[PDB]
């Protein structure tokens, strides 16, 4: 089984 | 030396599980230095700024429905999924506690010590009994200590005025064993 | 509540330190070695039951750094306030002379996540056998960390967990010696 | 001492690699980053340096990040005027910075007094062995006195790809292969030329070997490519 990650969102520019 | 100011950024996605995997809550949080600025609480369903510094993000991110959908469904594709991935060696991990009873190197009255170490999970229950009956007063705990290696330890004391023949029992209930572990001190 | 799994990551300027890890009820499941670009499990066993594409963590780290720069800028370059760690030294199990044990140095409630730790046996540094963990997250957003020193208890020996951190005006030496 | 030569067991076998050899070919077939008289303008992690180098070719990047073995190595070149030559990758290439971006390892050499006063290049001998016998010999060229082993390796394989099909789209004529470097002081070292076993080829993990930024003397170094065909 593989652990999945939550992707980091880019902040508002 | 090094006196330059530091600037920190943390991102934490917390999956909170209640009753196995029945109810799940995802909490996405951004912390600038030591302050949470923006977060996404699955219970709320959208990003909310925690401080003014975070307003731009909450507003921008919420304007993206694609992003919102992924986040809302993360309680399943992320939280519930990762829970299952490591359930066998985490949720179901069980290591029996090592239990011993001895008088403290301090202290008339005699201070007894019930050392409980090397156990996992951390939820545990230890009580003292004098002649088969729970001791409410005198008991003092060091609290649950997390060793950082999937192991816990704790010391639970019991001040007593010992009389020849008394039997002070330390009882320990833990998921690692079905019946409670008992270690006795014979006065 | 029953269980909590946390994916915690951070980037720190100007040390350009970065970290990515998973947490289960306070205990690290694994972290990604940013240099070798691979998953390092907290306990060897975990790696036999699960996996993680370490390379993926680096993509998150890139975004984290850029986001840090953005936040650094809109805070008008407000630096972080140093918060000194509480340091405690305990044993892995009730100590007994000549009976193998392990000294645990608990480095708690501190920030930023940069610290210098050293073990001392009678005023001198010890290397053999020591291990350490990466920085672990806390609800208050500060950090925790563990350093370990396997040892052979004796009445003579006096140990020290020497900790340095910008929040400390000077190196903190937590004394530990056999008292049983 | 010098690194011990490999025994058959030590080498990767193309027959144990199910992936697309073309992904390996890609890294050495007329593929490389090259810059002259440049200085790092940024860094992502302590062990890397970022440069402003543009894709003269197809305009696919203007920022290049090269990773080194340790921090000291990066500090050494961080503020120096240098030259760059190395094999880049895009899959799993990440970095923030502060146009396209590309990644690599090592490939750095000080520019001051490391060139030849005439646009004169230096020839480095490459002897190819197939099943232990020298089959063809030739020379690659460099414009540096002290050149990274990486630059020389890349040039060798580029040549061997077109003249000997070192790597083809899916698979290679050879079972094993390693390029060995021999320095004038007797020191030798080598790189496995074949991908690790399995159905996937991690380009980044493979290129990481160029980490050490190993440099050698171009006028005296000798190169040996040792190949083997599965059956002989």
């Amino acid at each position: 089984p593989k652990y999945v990650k939550q992707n980091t969102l880019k902040l508002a520019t | 030396g090094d006196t330059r100011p530091r600037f920190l950024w943390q991102l934490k996605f917390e999956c909170h599980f209640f009753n196995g995997t029945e109810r799940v809550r995802l909490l996405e949080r951004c912390i600038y230095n030591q302050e949470e600025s923006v977060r996404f609480d699955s219970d709320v369903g959208e990003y909310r700024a925690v401080t003014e510094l975070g307003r731009p993000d909450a507003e921008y991110w919420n304007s993206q429905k694609d992003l919102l959908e992924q986040r809302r469904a993360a309680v399943d594709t992320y939280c519930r999924h990762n829970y299952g991935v490591g359930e066998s060696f985490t949720v179901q991990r069980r290591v029996e506690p090592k239990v011993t009873v001895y008088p403290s190197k301090t202290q008339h009255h005699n201070l007894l010590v019930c050392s409980v170490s090397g156990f996992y999970p951390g939820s545990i229950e230890v009580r003292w009994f004098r002649n088969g009956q729970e001791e409410k007063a005198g008991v003092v705990s060091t609290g649950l200590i997390q060793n950082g290696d999937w192991t816990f330890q704790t010391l639970v004391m019991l001040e007593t005025v010992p009389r020849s023949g008394e039997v002070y029992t330390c009882q320990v209930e833990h998921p690692s064993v079905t019946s409670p572990l008992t270690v006795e001190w014979r006065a | 509540e029953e269980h909590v799994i946390i994916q915690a990551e951070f980037y720190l300027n100007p040390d350009q330190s970065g970290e990515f890890m998973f947490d289960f009820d306070g205990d690290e499941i694994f972290h990604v070695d940013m240099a070798k670009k691979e998953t390092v499990w907290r306990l060897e066993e975990f790696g036999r039951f699960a996996s993680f594409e370490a390379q993926g963590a680096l993509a998150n780290i890139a975004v984290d750094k850029a986001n840090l720069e953005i936040m650094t800028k809109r805070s008008n370059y407000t630096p972080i306030t140093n918060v000194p760690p509480e340091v405690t030294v305990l044993t892995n199990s009730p100590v007994e002379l000549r009976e193998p044990n392990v000294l645990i140095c608990f480095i708690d409630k501190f920030t930023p996540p940069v610290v210098n730790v050293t073990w001392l046996r009678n005023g001198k540094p010890v290397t053999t056998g020591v291990s350490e963990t990466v920085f672990l997250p806390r609800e208050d957003h500060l950090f925790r960390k563990f350093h370990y020193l396997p040892f052979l208890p004796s009445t003579e020996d006096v140990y020290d967990c020497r900790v340095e951190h910008w929040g400390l005006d000077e190196p903190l030496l937590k004394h530990w010696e056999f008292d049983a | 001492e010098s690194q011990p030569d490999p025994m058959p067991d030590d080498l990767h076998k193309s027959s144990e690699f199910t992936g697309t050899m073309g992904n390996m070919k890609y890294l050495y077939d007329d593929h490389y980053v090259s810059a002259t008289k440049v200085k790092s303008v940024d860094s992502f992690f302590k062990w890397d340096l970022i440069y402003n180098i543009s894709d003269k070719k197809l305009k696919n990047y203007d920022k290049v990040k090269t990773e080194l073995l340790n921090e000291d190595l990066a500090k050494k070149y961080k503020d120096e005027v240098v030259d760059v030559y190395g094999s880049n990758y895009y899959v799993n290439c990440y970095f923030s910075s502060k146009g396209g971006k590309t990644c690599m390892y090592g490939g750095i050499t000080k520019h001051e007094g490391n060139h030849f006063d005439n646009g004169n290049l230096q020839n480095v001998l490459v002897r190819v062995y197939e099943n232990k016998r020298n089959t063809i010999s030739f020379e690659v060229q460099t414009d540096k006195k002290s050149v990274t082993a990486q630059e020389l390796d890349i040039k060798a394989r580029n040549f061997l790809i077109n003249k000997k099909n070192l790597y083809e789209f899916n698979s290679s004529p050879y079972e094993t292969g390693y390029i060995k470097f021999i320095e004038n002081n007797g020191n030798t070292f080598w790189y496995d030329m074949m991908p690790a076993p399995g159905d996937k080829f991690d380009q980044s993990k493979y290129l990481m070997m160029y980490n050490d930024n190993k440099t050698v003397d171009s006028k005296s170094v000798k190169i040996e490519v040792h190949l083997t065909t599965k059956n002989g």
Side-chain angles (χ1 to χ4, degrees), chain A, chain B, chain C, chain D residues 2-232:
Chain A
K2 197 156 201 174
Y3 273 106
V4 175
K5 81 173 189 294
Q6 268 305 78
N7 302 323
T8 46
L9 303 163
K10 323 174 66 174
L11 294 179
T13 295
Chain B
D2 207 340
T3 56
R4 315 124 88 195
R6 311 285 133 161
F7 304 99
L8 182 66
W9 171 265
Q10 287 180 261
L11 181 44
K12 304 183 186 173
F13 299 88
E14 324 181 333
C15 286
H16 295 261
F17 302 93
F18 309 77
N19 197 314
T21 178
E22 248 187 62
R23 197 233 162 186
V24 176
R25 181 198 176 204
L26 176 52
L27 183 57
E28 182 184 328
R29 29 218 308 225
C30 305
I31 304 82
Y32 173 39
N33 281 316
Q34 204 192 316
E35 277 166 45
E36 173 168 12
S37 68
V38 207
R39 66 158 50 172
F40 171 92
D41 190 323
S42 63
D43 280 352
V44 169
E46 58 166 40
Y47 286 96
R48 288 297 169 73
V50 181
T51 64
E52 292 313 305
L53 277 168
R55 267 183 171 175
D57 312 310
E59 303 188 311
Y60 172 49
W61 292 332
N62 288 328
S63 74
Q64 297 172 59
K65 263 48 189 178
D66 292 308
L67 168 51
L68 251 38
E69 266 197 4
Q70 189 292 314
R71 248 53 174 177
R72 286 164 183 159
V75 303
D76 291 331
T77 64
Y78 178 73
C79 291
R80 292 176 203 278
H81 173 62
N82 285 338
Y83 182 99
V85 164
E87 167 161 42
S88 65
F89 55 92
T90 60
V91 173
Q92 275 146 45
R93 165 176 245 257
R94 270 150 187 56
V95 176
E96 194 183 346
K98 177 177 283 58
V99 189
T100 183
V101 165
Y102 57 85
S104 85
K105 293 129 295 183
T106 305
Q107 262 77 41
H108 189 258
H109 293 65
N110 190 210
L111 210 199
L112 292 181
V113 176
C114 186
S115 171
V116 186
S117 60
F119 64 94
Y120 190 94
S123 59
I124 193 170
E125 192 157 52
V126 335
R127 314 190 202 67
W128 273 108
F129 297 73
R130 176 186 138 295
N131 296 310
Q133 52 198 307
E134 174 108 50
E135 277 285 66
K136 291 299 174 57
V139 304
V140 175
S141 179
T142 188
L144 190 64
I145 305 296
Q146 186 159 40
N147 300 309
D149 66 344
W150 292 78
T151 272
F152 292 77
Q153 64 174 293
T154 186
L155 298 175
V156 177
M157 282 69 269
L158 174 66
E159 187 67 294
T160 66
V161 199
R163 298 172 59 278
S164 169
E166 296 179 308
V167 176
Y168 294 97
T169 301
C170 178
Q171 176 180 272
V172 184
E173 300 201 62
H174 186 266
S176 65
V177 298
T178 53
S179 53
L181 293 162
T182 54
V183 177
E184 314 177 343
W185 173 264
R186 305 290 180 102
Chain C
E1 191 172 75
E2 279 187 42
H3 299 299
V4 183
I5 293 175
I6 306 173
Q7 176 186 322
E9 37 184 297
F10 70 73
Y11 191 86
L12 171 69
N13 268 339
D15 306 71
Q16 50 194 187
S17 287
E19 179 175 303
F20 179 110
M21 62 115 268
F22 267 64
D23 195 313
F24 179 89
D25 292 344
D27 288 300
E28 167 183 5
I29 299 182
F30 74 84
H31 65 259
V32 169
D33 182 316
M34 301 295 119
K36 296 181 176 180
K37 305 184 187 179
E38 46 191 60
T39 301
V40 340
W41 307 88
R42 185 59 179 75
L43 302 183
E44 174 281 313
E45 18 181 305
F46 301 165
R48 280 186 278 117
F49 311 131
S51 58
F52 182 67
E53 191 184 304
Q55 206 74 73
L58 284 306
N60 267 35
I61 294 301
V63 175
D64 296 319
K65 180 173 190 182
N67 284 353
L68 172 64
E69 310 278 26
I70 288 175
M71 288 300 289
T72 296
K73 181 171 183 181
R74 59 203 206 203
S75 78
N76 253 58
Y77 305 90
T78 300
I80 193 173
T81 295
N82 292 314
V83 177
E86 271 176 42
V87 180
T88 308
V89 178
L90 292 185
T91 49
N92 190 70
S93 63
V95 69
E96 337 211 313
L97 293 179
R98 296 187 203 182
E99 296 293 65
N101 206 318
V102 176
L103 282 182
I104 305 174
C105 182
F106 302 77
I107 304 181
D108 208 7
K109 320 193 188 81
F110 69 86
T111 201
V114 175
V115 70
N116 182 72
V117 189
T118 300
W119 285 108
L120 294 178
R121 173 184 286 136
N122 304 312
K124 276 162 286 188
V126 187
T127 295
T128 58
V130 308
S131 59
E132 66 185 73
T133 68
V134 291
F135 300 92
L136 314 180
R138 286 176 54 79
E139 276 293 355
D140 54 31
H141 307 135
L142 298 179
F143 302 84
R144 0 151 54 175
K145 188 156 156 62
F146 299 82
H147 273 72
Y148 305 102
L149 169 52
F151 78 124
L152 203 65
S154 70
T155 59
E156 309 164 355
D157 294 318
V158 294
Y159 297 83
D160 283 298
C161 179
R162 184 175 184 290
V163 177
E164 297 187 301
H165 185 279
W166 298 310
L168 290 176
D169 288 329
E170 266 163 3
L172 177 47
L173 283 76
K174 291 304 291 189
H175 212 282
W176 189 92
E177 62 182 0
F178 181 65
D179 298 305
Chain D
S2 58
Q3 170 183 42
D5 275 4
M7 290 303 279
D9 292 56
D10 300 353
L11 306 168
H12 291 158
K13 286 84 72 177
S14 69
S15 72
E16 301 185 327
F17 176 66
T18 313
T20 305
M21 193 60 82
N23 288 314
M24 167 67 94
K25 181 179 204 250
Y26 174 71
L27 300 177
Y28 299 89
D29 189 359
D30 188 34
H31 177 81
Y32 63 84
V33 156
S34 185
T36 302
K37 255 181 68 179
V38 300
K39 182 189 293 62
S40 70
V41 297
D42 194 6
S43 154
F44 189 67
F45 277 131
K46 280 185 170 188
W47 59 81
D48 74 60
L49 301 180
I50 292 165
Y51 296 80
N52 282 308
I53 306 175
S54 295
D55 188 358
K56 343 287 183 179
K57 298 174 181 173
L58 296 304
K59 303 274 86 176
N60 284 180
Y61 66 82
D62 60 9
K63 291 281 189 177
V64 178
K65 180 194 66 157
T66 178
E67 283 176 80
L68 307 165
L69 182 65
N70 53 56
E71 205 191 320
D72 299 316
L73 208 42
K75 277 176 162 182
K76 181 198 292 178
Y77 300 108
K78 182 177 184 300
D79 302 307
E80 281 218 296
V81 182
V82 306
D83 295 313
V84 183
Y85 199 101
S87 177
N88 57 124
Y89 65 102
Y90 298 87
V91 176
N92 285 158
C93 174
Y94 312 118
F95 70 86
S96 177
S97 191
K98 279 166 188 152
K101 63 182 184 181
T102 192
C103 298
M104 63 177 277
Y105 299 88
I108 303 174
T109 48
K110 181 181 173 181
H111 179 281
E112 210 59 346
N114 194 54
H115 287 267
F116 304 97
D117 47 55
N118 247 175
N120 254 60
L121 303 181
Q122 172 74 194
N123 296 304
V124 181
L125 176 66
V126 180
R127 283 191 289 167
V128 185
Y129 300 71
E130 291 177 67
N131 297 310
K132 297 178 176 182
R133 302 180 65 73
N134 182 27
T135 50
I136 88 278
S137 294
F138 63 110
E139 304 171 308
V140 291
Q141 316 186 87
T142 181
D143 61 329
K144 312 176 185 64
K145 298 179 184 174
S146 183
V147 58
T148 67
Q150 166 161 32
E151 174 175 343
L152 293 182
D153 186 3
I154 290 171
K155 278 164 180 172
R157 306 198 205 187
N158 175 65
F159 179 85
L160 295 184
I161 281 174
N162 299 304
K163 301 292 147 52
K164 280 284 190 173
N165 292 311
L166 179 55
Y167 306 123
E168 290 176 303
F169 180 68
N170 53 300
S171 192
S172 163
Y174 308 95
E175 175 69 337
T176 76
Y178 65 84
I179 178 170
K180 171 176 179 175
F181 290 73
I182 303 166
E183 290 188 277
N184 58 347
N185 56 46
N187 177 57
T188 68
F189 58 95
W190 55 276
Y191 304 135
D192 189 322
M193 291 165 79
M194 290 299 160
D199 50 42
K200 294 147 188 171
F201 175 53
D202 190 319
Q203 301 177 312
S204 183
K205 257 161 48 59
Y206 178 77
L207 296 176
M208 196 175 286
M209 69 187 190
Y210 292 138
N211 228 176
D212 52 22
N213 201 62
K214 221 303 175 186
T215 53
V216 300
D217 178 52
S218 57
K219 54 179 171 57
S220 64
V221 74
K222 292 292 184 286
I223 298 173
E224 286 177 18
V225 169
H226 287 69
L227 312 174
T228 64
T229 53
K230 195 176 187 300
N231 52 55

